[PDB]
Symmetry: C3
């Protein structure tokens, strides 16, 4: 009277101590067990459970099932291991909305607030919005970087020439030895193994050594150098060249010749008295 | 007798074949259908369904609803794109906890373990912990990268100056001709078109050619150079200057003068016999 | 008759207006309230609520609970900040599957499709597959970058030391002064304060000034320089050294001596007539 049930099928059987069970062919064998509809079984004494649907099945201790051919699949789980979740978890029971051969979408759900709340598809999308933002940021950086590698790579291929041969297109030196050394104040040192030891000096050439204030050394005591292709000095502080000296040598030879003849004439007189 | 129901409202109607239905105004029209409470409708023969609440509504085949003005919204769904997946998903049914214009939070839920388990707000937080870690990693690299670009920029804007001008603040050459050439071992070549062909040599100046072991060439056969601002040599292996030579020229002129007078005196005698 | 309930416990009490309530010791105090099984309450002010299980508990307005010692924990919550949302959220009710002290895994669930669908552990795994992919990409870029910094520190620690010093391993100059200046066409200027003012000229040395076409200046009017370590000239356009000159000075001194003796002999004759 307020609980109608159209049927010509067999009796309901609420077998368990303190149990409830409604519907045709409904075998509730478990203590304090609920089950509702066409052959909703409460398997093994397996206690306190619930199955609410056509051919429903409560199989695990302290669990629930819901609907068509639904079954409890593991129930209470203790010291168990959840996905995305180091540290173990505890559970007081399962809640099935389906089966191992068949599952169910859980519609119309408000976005979780506290930690143990079902989270919906929207609350995920929000995360996945960032992953996306991030993934893009990465493609940029792989890109940006692949370029920096190229730029840096060129510097090593266009300057590398300069840092290794210590040379430029107009100040070249074919050598691989000791670094030039400009050791005195305002000194210049050109070429491997050169040394400008003195105030305001220049050491010009491989293993040149300038060891005296205000000089330009074209070599050393262990190895001098001739200077070549030098135009005749004109001013007082210009360098003289060999052709210039040659001129003087020439006048000296002319003199000696004159003195010879003079000596002859003086003999030619002395004796001709 | 153990199933009380306070009411003066109309009858329950468990209409469907094999169906159960309890509560006032509860119209269960569907076969093997359950529905419980104030006008909980099982719409269209739409089968095997369930609605458990005030004005509840089971509308889709094989589905469930729960609570105030709740409705099944799509039910079983075959080969359907599920969020985030890739391959199609199958579903035996829906389970509504609400409606299109009203939804419900699902509290007190143990963290999912297997793939088809509801995941809670905690299991998401764990993911979002990493997104955060990652996002920060990005901001760093963005920053670190930009810092490198600025660095590479400065190299590219300091080192270029050289690579084009072949010149540095302290070694300069106003020019745009042939790269200098240091072709001999340990040789030095300064300035466009210079050539240091010989062992241990220097070619000092535009189009200078030093073609002899142990020399410094200040030009070539096609164009020599004067060397200027040269102090008087003191040591044997110092370069002499013109004023120095001028001294010697001066003594020679004094000699010639003497020889003239001597010649006169010798004539002045010869003839005065 | 189709609703059996094995028990010797007290009566069910469907107290609330329009309410339903089945099972032993079941106190349904709330209007339009459902509750099913042993000792299940609907007290507090649990308007329209539901509890379906052993010792079940509907405590919050418009809410639901399900199973063993289950309780409604907050119910309808409006304009609450739920995890990850920024926007506030509305809710028509809670759905508990457990307790503040004890919770439940929700097995056998089809992957959510629309926004308000429970999402399963699988749908998360898909996300977390990318986070992983991304995290790896980061570790790479942190690496790739740590390299580039290395490579770039090096260039700075090689080249730019040039741009600061004006010096390469083989063209050094120990100086802070005025840049070099190569002002004439095809001119060369070496060292701080040097000036190559003239066509095709070289200014060799700190504050050297070459102000005449086709010259190499080793200094200036304000400060000249000796040139050292210079081999004896051989060719006409080679520079002469001092030892070369000393030889000529020596012959001149020999000549003057001769002329002295000649002069004496000439006097020795003149007067000896
Ligand atoms: Cl990420």
């Amino acid at each position: 009277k307020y609980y109608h049930a159209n049927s010509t099928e067999e009796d309901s059987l609420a077998v368990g101590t303190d149990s409830l069970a409604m519907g045709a062919k409904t075998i509730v064998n478990a203590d304090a067990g609920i089950g509702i509809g066409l052959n909703t079984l409460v398997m093994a004494d397996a206690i306190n459970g619930i199955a609410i649907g056509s051919n429903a099945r409560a199989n695990h201790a302290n669990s629930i099932a819901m609907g068509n051919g639904s079954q409890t699949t593991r129930g209470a789980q203790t010291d168990y291991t959840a996905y995305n979740m180091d540290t173990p978890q505890n559970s007081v029971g399962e809640f099935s909305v389906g089966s191992e051969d068949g599952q169910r979408q859980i519609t119309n759900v408000a976005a979780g607030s506290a930690d143990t709340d079902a989270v919906n598809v929207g609350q995920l999308k929000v995360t996945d919005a960032q992953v996306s933002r991030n993934t893009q940021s990465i493609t940029n950086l792989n890109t940006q970087v692949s370029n920096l590698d190229t730029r840096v790579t060129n510097i090593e291929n266009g300057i590398g020439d300069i840092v290794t041969t210590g040379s430029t297109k107009y100040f070249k030196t074919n050598t691989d030895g000791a670094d030039a050394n400009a050791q005195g104040a305002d000194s210049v040192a050109i070429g491997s193994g050169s040394i400008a030891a003195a105030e305001n000096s220049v050491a010009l050439g491989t293993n040149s050594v300038a060891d005296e204030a205000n000089t330009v050394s074209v070599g050393s005591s262990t190895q001098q150098r001739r200077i070549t292709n030098v135009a005749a000095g004109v001013n007082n502080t210009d360098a003289v060249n060999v052709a210039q000296m040659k001129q003087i040598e020439d006048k000296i030879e002319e003199i000696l010749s004159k003195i010879y003849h003079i000596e002859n004439e003086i003999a030619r007189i002395k004796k001709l008295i």
